[PDB]
Design a protein around this nucleic acid. Structure first.
Ligand SMILES: [Mg+2]
Ligand SMILES: [Mg+2]
Ligand SMILES: [Mg+2]
Ligand SMILES: [Mg+2]
Ligand SMILES: [Zn+2]
Ligand SMILES: [Zn+2]
Lengths: 80, 118, 148, 157, 42, 205, 146, 140, 37
RNA sequence: CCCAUAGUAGGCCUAAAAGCAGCCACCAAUUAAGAAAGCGUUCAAGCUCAACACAAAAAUCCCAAACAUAUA
RNA sequence: ACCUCGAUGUUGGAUCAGGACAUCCCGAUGGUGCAGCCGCUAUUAAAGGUUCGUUUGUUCAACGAUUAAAGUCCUACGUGAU
């Protein structure tokens, strides 16, 4: 993992999937071992971007997705 | 079509046919599935044999029993046939067999939540 | 380097106490066979062995079979051998019970209890129908510490 | 054999039949019944008082922080008069309708941590948040005026 | 699978089991005798 | 003395006269020590049986080891082994008279409380080792509190009152319906069909 | 029903979802089975009923989502296992002996080499005990063991 | 990683309580005790002092220190060298509420200890509870 | 595997699974805990 | 499933036993975490937990054949 | 003390062995205080094999030398109209 960006619009209709996602994964409890990552939370239908500086960019429209689905997809991509 | 018989339950794996060749160590116990694979007629033949009366007429009766694993039957036997007995078990239909009309006729039982992966 | 080992010698079998009876001799006399001795535990020195990693912390010398009927004896417990490095001091309570430095050296740690006698053993002209059957002696059970 | 035995003695067939006939029979409860049809008030009063005591309110998700980091953030906030608060959503959801905050319903879900105050040090608070590129500022409502994050930024500037 | 000794008499006997038919027979007799009790009660 | 007292193997003064093996002392429901006394928890005997000094030592050691002396206290609700059991010299043919007193034992009937625990402690804090001891015991035993005992009893009356079977063992036996008294014991009239030998059938109404 | 589609960029879309048929025979029932008066009137071969609680690949759906009772969920799961083993759901598969009413998985039952004596015979289970309370249209109760 | 020690300022090299415990991570004992003695000179001498050393992965020392202990401080304030045995009935020294307040004045000031509660009650109650657990009675 | 009539999880990672007709206690951290019914 | 700052390594005891070798007490902060419920520690350090939040086997060869659902 | 006392002594050995598996070896696996080799322990497996001598009726046992092993038993303590 190289970079991650989480964006959501609770001012608009709320979407708890991305909120739980950033509460769980974007925590130093994980970053302590995943120090390589650089997290940013630019908040304003939502969107979670993950930049792998090797060759990859992963975009998650976590509107209809749930925290479990997006975490599993993130883990699978991390495994690569 | 004796090859296509169906056992209720796990009899295919549990039912065991025991025979003994007579020689020491000649006790052979073969499961129903193995016996069916070896001979596609032994299961029905043995069932009829065990249901027939245990007297000297049993094998004369068995001489009148003609078992064929598949749809093919000899021409002479086919010409001999007189009546066809109804199958004792009505074969349940599969979903692939159910007509769309029957599917529509059967009511939907529950309202699945819209936000579910399924 | 250093290992605390619990060697337990075998237990001799307890002799049987039965009496013979056959068609034309009803009072055939004692048939109590003697029990086999317990197998000793002997630390034999090994040149190939260089560290006490191999030796276990619990050794149980095999116990001898009990005496049977028809005067049948009991198979004595087989000897249990603990291969040890050359130059192994064996100490019970700081006693240095053994040195075990030379090749081929061996020290009997726990002697297997001797087997119990049967009634036929006590059979004699004076005693024409003994009922005694000495119980098999218990085997030694001691904690030996091994230091290179 | 004796009347009392270490094993379960074999009953006379008549006695066995008697036992079988006299076995217990439970009733059938008609159609299956299943298939048939002060800390709480302490929190209530505390939140009621706080909603009037506070003049500006914001909420964040300080759950990605460790014990020591959260403690440091608490000390930095206490450097100002701003007080951080935590309360169950289970009891906060009624509070929104109680205090007439309909627009605040889709804001308090999951870990929510309030930042009540009367003097905005939001400039320095956002500066502190900046070096930690996470823990985004969430929407709030100052003096009955719902402010989005852009509104908070404008108010800060 | 053999039963030691003689069936139905020893400590170890053939297990005997009550059939629904036997239970029904016993219940029928019990009903007849309950009616007998009633008719003897007066 | 919040600890379970030591039980002697045999009475200091033994019984010179050998007495018969009256198995009625094991047969049937227990009529003594059937209710809690200065305690909350206990081991209930769901079947008749004889308790040896070996069982007594097992119970004492286990309970004393696994209970808190300062809070939990234990008390024996069964007398020390008193009934003498005689064993003939091994290998001797039948006859020659009753053998000598080999051991001492204590009878226990179904429904009897064997050990009673008490003190500032809830039921689950004791269920573990009391149930282990119950399984160790020679008869079907159960770790029962006052509440659990009352609950199971009340359930027994509920079963008796709501059972839909028109025919009950008590009714048939007392009325001698099918001549079944030719097959029943006179004690069955009072055991109501719930006891067979030394075994007690709680499931049966 | 939401489905996840990839392109990497992945997103979820909610598609058309079926609805319960109007006018349940017994409204205000705990489970759908009771609502539609099917408490003891469905068997392993009632695929039309069973498939309504089945993932597209054959797995059962959770009780929380289905709304079934505990016992009804267990019955449906067992009936579905039996139907799958009987081959009545050819389209609900993960990606030759004919059977039916198979309680156990075929690969987990050992042959009965030594059936016991008459009083202790080892019987071969048939059907499931969970369906013991089904409607009985026969004079004799159906045997769960053969 | 953080390593917690309660070493006495008077004796900077007791031995076992610092050598083996700190050597697992890899340390310079000479530098450690030199800094400890520097802090000992900075503060009163001959008093236990909690430490908040954090062994960085770069093999560097960041020693953080605060107020002396609470147990020994209370014992000295009460004129006690060894604490009471029972501590529920036994008592050796009595400390007044005014004295407790005075000592608390210089207590809620350390960062590592996190004793930064604005209200005086939160600190006075805590120290009172500590004294009660100790064999010290609270006068009036 | 050790054959046990009653299967008990020994550590946190021990898990019960019914495979090939019988219950098993499987354990990754301490494969010593492997039990079979 | 989540998650764990801390008066302090509460005192005596002990070379030292710090929630956890033993004895006395068991209060106390922060919205919240027992002077600790179990592991682990020579002692520490670390792991979680309670918190906050969200049944069976023996010896010649198993032993009727089978059957789940048409009305009492 | 239930069959056999109106011609079956018995124990060992020889010969031939049938059978069980609660497996001694050979086969396949799990655990291990399993680094490897030796091992220990447990599951599965009975197709095949499981020595020769000294003393002594002796089965057994001790001892000598081996073996991959020198298995526990039942078979009228298998078999003596062989
Ligand atoms: Mg017989
Ligand atoms: Mg007689
Ligand atoms: Mg085996
Ligand atoms: Mg015999
Ligand atoms: Zn229902
Ligand atoms: Zn484990």
């Amino acid at each position: 993992v190289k970079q991650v960006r989480v964006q959501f619009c609770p001012f608009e209709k709320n979407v708890e999937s991305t909120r739980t996602f950033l509460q769980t994964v974007s925590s130093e409890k994980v970053r302590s071992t995943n120090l390589n990552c650089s997290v940013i939370a630019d908040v304003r239908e939502p969107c979670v971007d993950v930049l792998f500086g090797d060759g990859h960019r992963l975009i998650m429209r976590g509107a209809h997705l749930t925290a479990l689905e997006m975490l599993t997809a993130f883990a699978s991509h991390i495994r690569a | 079509n004796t090859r296509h018989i169906a056992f209720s339950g796990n009899k295919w794996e549990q039912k065991v046919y025991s025979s003994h060749t007579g020689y020491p160590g000649g006790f052979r116990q073969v499961t129903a599935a193995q016996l069916h694979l070896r001979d596609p007629v032994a299961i029905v033949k043995l069932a009829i044999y065990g249901m027939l009366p245990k007297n000297l007429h049993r094998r004369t009766m068995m001489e009148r029993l003609h078992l064929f694993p598949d749809e093919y039957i000899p021409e002479d036997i086919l010409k001999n046939l007189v009546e066809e007995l109804p199958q004792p078990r009505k074969i349940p239909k599969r979903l692939d067999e159910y007509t769309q009309e029957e599917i529509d006729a059967f009511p939907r039982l529950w309202t699945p939540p819209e936000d579910y992966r399924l | 380097d250093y290992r605390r080992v619990l060697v337990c010698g075998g237990n001799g079998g307890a002799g049987a106490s039965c009496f013979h009876s056959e068609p034309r001799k009803e009072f055939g006399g004692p048939d109590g066979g003697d029990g086999g001795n317990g197998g000793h535990v002997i630390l034999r020195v090994d040149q190939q062995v260089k560290s006490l990693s191999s030796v276990l912390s619990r050794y149980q010398g095999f116990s001898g079979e009990d005496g049977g009927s028809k005067n049948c004896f009991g198979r004595s417990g087989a000897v249990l051998y603990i291969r040890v490095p050359v130059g192994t001091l064996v100490k019970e309570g700081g006693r240095v019970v053994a040195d075990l430095s030379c090749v081929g050296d061996e020290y009997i740690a726990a002697l297997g209890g001797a087997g119990g006698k049967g009634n036929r053993f006590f059979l004699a002209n004076n005693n024409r129908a003994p009922v005694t059957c000495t119980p098999g002696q218990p085997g030694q059970q001691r904690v030996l510490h091994l230091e290179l | 054999s004796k009347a009392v035995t270490r094993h379960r003695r074999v009953m006379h067939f008549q006695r066995q039949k008697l036992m079988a006939v006299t076995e217990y029979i439970p009733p059938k409860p008609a159609i299956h019944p299943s298939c048939l049809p002060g800390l709480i008030r302490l929190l209530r009063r505390e939140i009621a008082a706080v909603f009037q005591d506070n003049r500006m309110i914001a909420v964040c998700q300080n759950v990605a922080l460790s014990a020591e980091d959260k403690l440091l953030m608490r000390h930095q906030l206490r450097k100002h008069k701003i007080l951080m608060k935590v309360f169950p959503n289970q009891v906060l959801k009624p509070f929104l309708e109680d205090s007439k905050y309909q627009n605040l319903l889709p804001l308090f879900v999951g870990h929510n941590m309030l930042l009540v105050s009367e003097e905005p040090k939001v400039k320095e608070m956002v500066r502190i948040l900046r070096t930690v590129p996470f823990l985004p500022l969430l929407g709030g409502c100052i003096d009955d005026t719902i402010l989005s994050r852009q509104g908070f930024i404008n108010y800060s500037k | 699978g053999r039963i030691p000794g003689r069936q139905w008499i020893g400590k170890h006997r053939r297990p005997r089991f009550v059939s629904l038919r036997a239970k029904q027979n016993m219940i029928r007799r019990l009903e007849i005798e309950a009616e007998n009790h009633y008719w003897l009660s007066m | 003395k919040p600890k379970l007292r030591f039980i002697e193997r045999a009475p200091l003064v033994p019984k010179v006269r050998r007495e018969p093996k009256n198995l009625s002392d094991i047969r049937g429901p227990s009529t003594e020590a059937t209710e809690f006394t200065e305690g909350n928890f206990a081991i209930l005997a769901l079947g008749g049986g004889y308790l040896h000094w070996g069982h007594f030592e097992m119970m004492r050691l286990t309970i004393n080891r696994s209970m808190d002396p300062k809070n939990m206290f234990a008390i024996w609700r069964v007398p020390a082994p008193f009934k003498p059991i005689t064993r003939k010299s091994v290998g001797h043919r039948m006859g020659g008279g009753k053998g000598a007193i080999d051991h001492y034992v204590t009878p226990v009937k179904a429904g009897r409380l064997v050990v009673e625990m008490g003190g500032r402690c809830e039921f689950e804090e004791v269920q573990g080792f009391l149930d282990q001891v119950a399984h160790k015991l020679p008869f079907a035993a159960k770790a029962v509190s006052r509440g659990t005992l009352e609950k199971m009893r009340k359930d027994q009356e509920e079963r008796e009152r709501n059972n839909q079977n028109p025919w009950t063992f008590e009714r048939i036996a007392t009325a001698n319906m099918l001549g079944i008294r030719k097959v029943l014991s006179p004690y069955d009239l009072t055991h109501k069909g719930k006891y067979w030998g030394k075994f007690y059938m709680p499931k049966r109404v | 029903f939401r489905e996840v589609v990839e392109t990497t960029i992945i997103e979820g879309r909610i598609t058309a979802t079926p609805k319960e048929s109007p006018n349940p025979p017994n409204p205000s029932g705990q489970c759908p089975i009771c609502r539609w008066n099917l408490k003891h009137k469905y068997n392993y071969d009632d695929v039309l009923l069973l498939s309504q609680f089945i993932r597209p690949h054959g797995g059962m759906l959770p009780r929380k989502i289905t709304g079934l009772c505990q016992e009804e969920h267990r019955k449906i799961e067992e009936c579905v296992k039996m139907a799958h083993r009987a081959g009545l759901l050819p389209n609900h598969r993960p990606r030759q002996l004919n059977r039916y009413l198979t309680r156990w998985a075929p690969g987990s039952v050992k042959p009965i080499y030594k059936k016991g004596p008459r009083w202790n015979r080892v019987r071969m289970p048939v059907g499931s005990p969970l369906l013991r309370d089904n409607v009985c249209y026969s004079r004799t109760p159906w045997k769960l063991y053969h | 990683g953080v390593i917690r020690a309660i070493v006495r300022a008077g004796l900077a090299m007791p031995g076992p309580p610092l050598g083996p415990v700190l050597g697992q991570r890899g340390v310079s004992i000479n530098q450690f005790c030199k800094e400890f003695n520097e802090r000992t000179k900075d503060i009163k001498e001959g008093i236990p002092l909690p430490t908040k050393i954090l062994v960085k992965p770069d093999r560097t020392f960041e020693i953080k220190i605060g107020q002396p202990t609470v147990s020994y401080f209370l014992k000295a304030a009460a004129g006690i060298e060894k604490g009471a045995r029972q501590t529920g009935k036994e008592v050796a020294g009595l400390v007044t509420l005014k004295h407790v307040y005075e000592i608390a004045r210089i207590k809620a000031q350390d960062e590592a200890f996190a004793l930064q509660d604005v209200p005086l009650s939160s600190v006075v109650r805590s120290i009172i509870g500590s004294a009660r657990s100790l064999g010290i009675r609270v006068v009036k | 595997f050790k054959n046990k009539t009653v299967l008990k999880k020994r550590c946190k990672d021990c898990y019960l699974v019914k495979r090939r007709g019988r219950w098993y206690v499987y354990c990754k951290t301490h494969p010593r805990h492997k039990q079979r019914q």
